[PDB]
Amino acid sequence: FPITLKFVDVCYRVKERTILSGVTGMISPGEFMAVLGPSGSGKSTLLNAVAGRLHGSNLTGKILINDGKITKQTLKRTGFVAQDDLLYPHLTVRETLVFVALLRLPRSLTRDVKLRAAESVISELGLTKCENTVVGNTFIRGISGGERKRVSIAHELLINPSLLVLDEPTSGLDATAALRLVQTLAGLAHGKGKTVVTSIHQPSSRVFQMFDTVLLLSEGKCLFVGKGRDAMAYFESVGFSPAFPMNPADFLLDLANGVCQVRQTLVTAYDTLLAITTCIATWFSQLCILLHRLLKERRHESFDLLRIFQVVAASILCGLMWWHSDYRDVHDRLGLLFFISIFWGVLPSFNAVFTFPQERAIFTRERASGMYTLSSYFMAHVLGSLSMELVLPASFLTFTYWMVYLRPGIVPFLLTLSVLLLYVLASQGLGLALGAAIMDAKKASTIVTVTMLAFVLTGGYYVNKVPSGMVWMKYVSTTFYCYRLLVAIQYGSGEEILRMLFVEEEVIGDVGMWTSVGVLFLMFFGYRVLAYLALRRI
Amino acid sequence: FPITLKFVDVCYRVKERTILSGVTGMISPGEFMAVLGPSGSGKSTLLNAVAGRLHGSNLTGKILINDGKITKQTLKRTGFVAQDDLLYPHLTVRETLVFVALLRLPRSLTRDVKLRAAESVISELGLTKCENTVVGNTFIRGISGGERKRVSIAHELLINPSLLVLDEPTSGLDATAALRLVQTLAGLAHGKGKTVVTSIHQPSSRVFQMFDTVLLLSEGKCLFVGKGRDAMAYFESVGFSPAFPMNPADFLLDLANGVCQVRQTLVTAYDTLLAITTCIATWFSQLCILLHRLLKERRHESFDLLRIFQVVAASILCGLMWWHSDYRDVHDRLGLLFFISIFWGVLPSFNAVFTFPQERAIFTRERASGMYTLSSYFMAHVLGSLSMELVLPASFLTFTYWMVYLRPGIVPFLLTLSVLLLYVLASQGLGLALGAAIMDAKKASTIVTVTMLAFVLTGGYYVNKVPSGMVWMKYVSTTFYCYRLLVAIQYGSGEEILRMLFVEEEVIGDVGMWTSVGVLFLMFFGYRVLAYLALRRI
């Protein structure tokens, strides 16, 4: 319940650099310590010794919680708020925390007690007035910048921690907003008895006064530690004082650099003055939350009105160039089944490469704190993009089948619909597999266009006389199989239009109807087992 | 030479809002006034009465320079630095100002005196240590954030102004950097005798002390105007004083909101206490600078290593699927001239839509201050993208003509090369025309893909039996003419392969060889006169 961080001589290196060189401090419960210092002075590198996320040869020193070397028993009461607010844009403020409660709180609790443990942090972090507004981001009209930091603090206030370690929470806020956000972080130490240690960039006048304890670092030597009242009165005991009306934070940061109307002199004054079946049951609940959580993310990636327009446009071009087409024109119709097969191998695999890059930050953050394990995260993008990446092609083909006059009958329709969707999902798994192998979104959006070019050229339409050494590349192609199958569903084995009439080199093809459905399934599962094995390195 | 801004009762409205409600002040030469206030209190709306860029029914009030109503004779000595540093990323620090000097200083001066009037502002704004480093941006390794504001202040220090009106220059800078940047803005008033009025967001302790005069606005009523020493000593004459060690800017901003341990009380204490051939010669020099200026911008848009890879890839696919192709296979070769014709109508027109959107901020800023006129700006993108958007296609076709075994002979080569480049530039003018009509880069990158889809479908390859009502749309198509011409250059009028053998429906076509070269020229000039008429509204 109480956490007395009692770190001493916290040293640290990096490969040449040294961030911390013997810091020492104590942080008792009910006490609002604030670590101050110049930029690059070693602030964040020491908050990540209170967050316990830096231990090895770099960190040297004994970091203690209640005089005990740190454990994950001691890491269930510590919540480290980082500077990046990683929130999903389309979730309401309440949904954003209702979902994190179910994922974070232990499942032993009921699912109706988890709803109030996530709605009390709303009411006590002052979010009651904006609990039902979209979080948004720069592009989406959302919440204020001061509310987007409270919401990111309610994440770590859901496990009810003891040692709460924020990392520059006020940076980028208003003048009054960054005062209230520290008025609230005082109530967590003065009204709840927590141990809150935060670093602030440039405190205002009222924001420095509300500190109980203060810690100053120049370059990693702990120039001063103690109360906020005893800081400005300590330094003049060596001969330093403001020459003009100052903010006591302003005066103390200047001393951190050595600028007096002195850095090395203020460090030597520290030597002598201030020296079985459930496991498959939790997985299917991590997946049921991760599917309903990021459901509006899979409804903005898919029903963007610049994708509905690029498909309502193709549906009126593709259904006007071929209006009441005739099946006897075997060459006008094999070029329709290759536009349908080009459009839907490029549209899915391209838009599916901006999915893993865009969420590598929210994933690795929320994966390292428990809360899911990449088997339920991967399988919630997979199962969530299947459901949404089939509504545009299913409705393009429903419009481009009765105006184009393709093969009538409910059986040839549902077999063309079935073959499109199985190909829309087999090419989309090419996006997911390249997006995850190359975690860059613009470097991987070019390799999925140089790859759908090698797939469209070798797809069997432009070239009928492929060289003897380039014949294999149509087999690893995904458009070869959707086009072999789209033709065989509208014409067949010839013999019904060879009865009516160049129509045996483009109508009989090379592969069966089942080796074309059995390899558009080995590319469904095969391009997802590679999208996962590529994420097993993050 | 001296500027005594003597504005009085500067009122302002907007449609309901009111930013300023009777401000009054005086700003004499040699005097560093700093206007302070809360966010939205009316700071920037009053700096844009010193920048003279807000006059009409909204602004009401007499704004005076040397007791004279403002003119562009009085607007040649005023330089308004705005918050956005709009610099071209690839220009060196010296080139960025050497180019602005030639465009800004009057051409009566020599071109070697303009070189020193632009290198003295380098030396006296402390840029000598980084004059030969790339400016860069977030993506490009460039200069510091404090040097990127000096460079944007050397722009307005090139016409040698008198009333220099900066707008929040320190916002987003370091702790020490924002001190030096105000140490330098004091030398412009203490070492050069200028009239410098700037608004600062949250001054530090040493940054408030370096103000000569100060102006405080709560919501547009001028709570206080006067020296920096007389501000904290004035308010206690009504009973206000800091209850704890403050920065005097911190204490005064709190009073701006009415927060004392009062807003309306501090305003009433102001009523009674502080109450022919040369014109075508300048144009061809504005164009010679604007071409050498943004030349490295037309070398990053064009030689991006993800465009060299998307064209070195197509050149090895297109030259491996058709390796030693045979001219007797009339259908394998008409599908090669439609890949060449699809690739080069989509690659140029797509990448040419992100040009006018990305520079609508640097253009409108630098156009309103003289310095060019959109006839020389437009004609420097046009003439600058022609030269660079022909190096990739000219070198794709040089590789895909002697491996593919197209029609041998220097005359059929240079006629295919000539027809490609004329089509690469006629489709690129479709990007420029849509990018400028729709100044959004992602909303216009979708209409130039729904348009190159209607152009590729009606290009005469996929459909040979186009409906009776959709036959016109191949004539307004740009791929129809590059494909009609690419075929006629490799086959001709038939008669040489009809001698050797479906090859009269795809080889003779509809349009002549001169109506196909005479409409790929009416789309060069026609898609540029529309890209310009769309920019004549910005």
Ligand SMILES: CC1=CC(=O)CC(C)(C)[C@@]1(O)/C=C/C(C)=C\C(=O)O
């Ligand atoms: C998928 C893709 C990748 C490229 O690099 C070229 C291009 C843009 C043309 C393309 O859309 C390819 C499609 C092609 C060749 C044919 C078509 O569209 O009918």
